[PDB]
Write a protein that binds this ligand. Structure first.
Ligand SMILES: CCCCCCCCO[C@@H]1O[C@H](CO)[C@@H](O)[C@H](O)[C@H]1O
Ligand SMILES: CCCCCCCCO[C@@H]1O[C@H](CO)[C@@H](O)[C@H](O)[C@H]1O
Ligand SMILES: CCCCCCCCO[C@@H]1O[C@H](CO)[C@@H](O)[C@H](O)[C@H]1O
Ligand SMILES: CCCCCCCCO[C@@H]1O[C@H](CO)[C@@H](O)[C@H](O)[C@H]1O
Ligand SMILES: CCCCCCCCO[C@@H]1O[C@H](CO)[C@@H](O)[C@H](O)[C@H]1O
Ligand code: NA
Ligand code: NA
Length: 505
């Protein structure tokens, strides 16, 4: 089995797994939609009661499985709980990252396309003033790129450039993954994460210099970091905070587990896992939190910035920020640096969420790495045409896999590892080889607080929010639901074939 070559490479690869589009695009929108500082108290508590403990649990499960030649949850769940229902539940550890990859890599390809166009200066020129006259050319730029519907049909028509850039993006992902763990993912992380950190710090510094008649970047930081204890009673904020914690740390994707399956059986995971988790949170709240929101607040004020965040999920990062930059000398190049930052953040995450399918084809069906990578890329590239051409298919996949799925799977993996496998056996496995020990209080958190916290979350979610999404959406949501359900059945069939191959061997 491949292993990570160095401790630093392991940490930077895991940090690149975590640090992605969720830090720089998702977190600012989630925080702004939910009152800024009102969002941060639940967010911090969720990190301490969910993020950290599940990170350690996923590192432990992966290292445990890797020592027996298994890096994905169908086999690992079965090692922890010899029961054919364990293999079936483990399919979600292939399905969730595959479904997320199907729309994550496409969004990633937008950042590359925008980076290219901004580098070469093929960008809108606002009029030499009214905010709408500045924002509209950049809204039109995005809408022409992804092909937003101009009539009533729920149909997208991406530009030829966007389609080609998606092929290029897929090719870049493949060229890293096909070289493997140490010579591919690890080597790239050592280059990408330093670059990513420098670009982000430079953009924060540039954004901190923004000042208009409507405010300063400081006004944005006060909005994000000022507690509002009245919102501690709103379940929606807690739901939003925990969902972001899952998404930003790659928890419930089966991806941390697969990466940790390449950690040597004796090697520490307590300190390594905490460091990767801590690096992501720094990149999230310090870097991601200090670029988009302060820039938007400085130019428009809190109320307009909040409304911009609510209007869309891509408004802030693809329309508003480049528009703001356009009003400053060298703003087109700053836009390039922003989208180049997003691309590297995205790329280091998309190789991580495609590796589980690769590891399954290698570990369980005994495919060569070459064939495993090429077939995985083929499945993602083909399936992505649904997200490219059907309006709101992206949203449907992000909900079932990237929102509900991750939380459900995090509770599932905790119950399997800490209740069924055994809390004391799980606790020993986490701490074995640790440079540090997990604090004893966290044994009680993992066994009792974390599962109850999530169970309550999922119940209030399913009762007071989800029904709207099962009765109000447009009929085309069933196209995406049908397809991703078919993907689950396809992956279940592959697990079945892996069973019969081991039976026959
Ligand atoms: C199925 C993939 C369709 O892809 C489409 O292909 C057309 C010709 O191939 C191009 O002109 C379009 O830009 C592209 O979106
Ligand atoms: C990486 C580079 C991507 C290839 C650039 C393709 C851009 O081609 C585009 O599509 C149409 C041409 O068929 C026309 O609109 C223009 O020629 C151009 O806008
Ligand atoms: C979910 C499945 C999505 C497949 C969408 C592929 C649609 C390709 O679209 C085709 O592109 C042509 C290029 O000449 C255009 O004339 C038309 O839009 C269509 O014929
Ligand atoms: C997934 C569905 C995406 C298919 C893209 C359809 O593309 C085109 O749509 C137009 C209808 O308005 C017509 O040009 C044709 O029916 C079709 O080729
Ligand atoms: C919520 C969980 C966050 C609490 C982590 C604080 C660590 O707490 C420390 O851990 C040590 C190891 O058990 C103990 O020996 C110390 O007495 C304890 O204060
Ligand atoms: Na993240
Ligand atoms: Na990343």
């Amino acid at each position: 089995r491949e292993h990570w070559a160095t401790r630093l490479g392991l940490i930077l690869a895991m940090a690149g797994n975590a640090v992605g589009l969720g830090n720089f695009l998702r977190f600012p929108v989630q925080a702004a939609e939910n009152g800024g500082g009102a969002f941060m108290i639940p967010y911090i508590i969720a990190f301490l009661l969910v993020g950290i403990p599940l990170m350690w649990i996923e590192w432990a499960m992966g290292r445990y499985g890797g020592a027996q030649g298994h890096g994905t949850t169908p086999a690992i769940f079965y090692l922890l709980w010899r029961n054919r229902f364990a293999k079936i539940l483990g399919v979600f550890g292939l399905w969730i990252p595959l479904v997320v990859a199907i729309y994550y890599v496409y969004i990633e390809s937008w950042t590359l396309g925008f980076a290219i166009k901004f580098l070469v200066g093929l960008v809108p020129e606002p009029p030499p003033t009214d905010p709408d006259s500045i924002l509209r050319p950049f809204k039109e730029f995005l809408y022409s790129y992804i092909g937003v519907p101009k009539g009533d049909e729920p149909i997208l028509k991406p530009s030829l450039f966007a389609y080609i850039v998606f092929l290029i993006t897929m090719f870049i992902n493949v060229s890293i993954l096909i070289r493997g763990i140490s010579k591919g993912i690890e080597r790239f992380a050592k280059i990408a994460m330093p670059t990513l950190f420098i670009l982000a710090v430079f953009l924060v510094i540039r954004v901190f210099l923004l000042e208009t008649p409507n405010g300063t970047a400081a006004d944005g930081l006060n909005f994000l970091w000022t507690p509002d204890f009245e919102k501690l009673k709103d379940p929606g904020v807690w739901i939003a905070a925990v969902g972001q914690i899952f998404f930003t740390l790659s928890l419930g994707f089966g991806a941390i587990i697969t990466y940790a399956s390449y950690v040597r059986k004796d090697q520490d995971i307590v300190l390594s896992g905490l460091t990767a988790a801590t690096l992501n949170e720094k990149a999230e709240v310090i870097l991601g939190g200090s670029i988009s929101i302060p820039a938007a607040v400085a130019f428009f004020g809190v109320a307009n910035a909040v409304a911009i965040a609510k209007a869309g999920a891509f408004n802030l990062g693809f329309i508003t920020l480049p528009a703001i930059f356009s009003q400053t000398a060298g703003g087109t190049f700053l836009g390039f640096l922003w989208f180049f930052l997003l691309f590297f953040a995205g790329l280091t995450s998309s190789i991580a969420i495609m590796q589980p399918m690769i590891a399954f084809l290698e570990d369980e069906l005994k495919l060569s790495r070459k064939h495993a990578v090429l077939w995985t890329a083929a499945i993602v590239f083909f399936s992505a045409h649904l997200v490219m051409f059907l309006n709101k298919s992206l949203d449907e996949m992000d909900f079932w896999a990237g929102t509900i799925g991750v939380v459900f799977f995090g509770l599932t993996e905790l119950i399997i590892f800490f209740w069924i496998f055994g809390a004391d056996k799980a606790w020993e496995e986490i701490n074995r080889g640790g440079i540090i020990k997990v604090p004893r209080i966290y044994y009680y958190v993992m066994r009792y607080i974390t599962p109850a916290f999530l169970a309550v979350l999922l119940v209030v979610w399913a009762r007071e929010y989800i029904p709207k999404i099962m009765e109000e959406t447009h009929w085309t949501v069933w196209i995406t639901r049908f397809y991703i359900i078919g993907l689950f059945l396809f992956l279940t069939f592959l697990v079945f074939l892996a069973e019969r191959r081991r039976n026959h061997e």
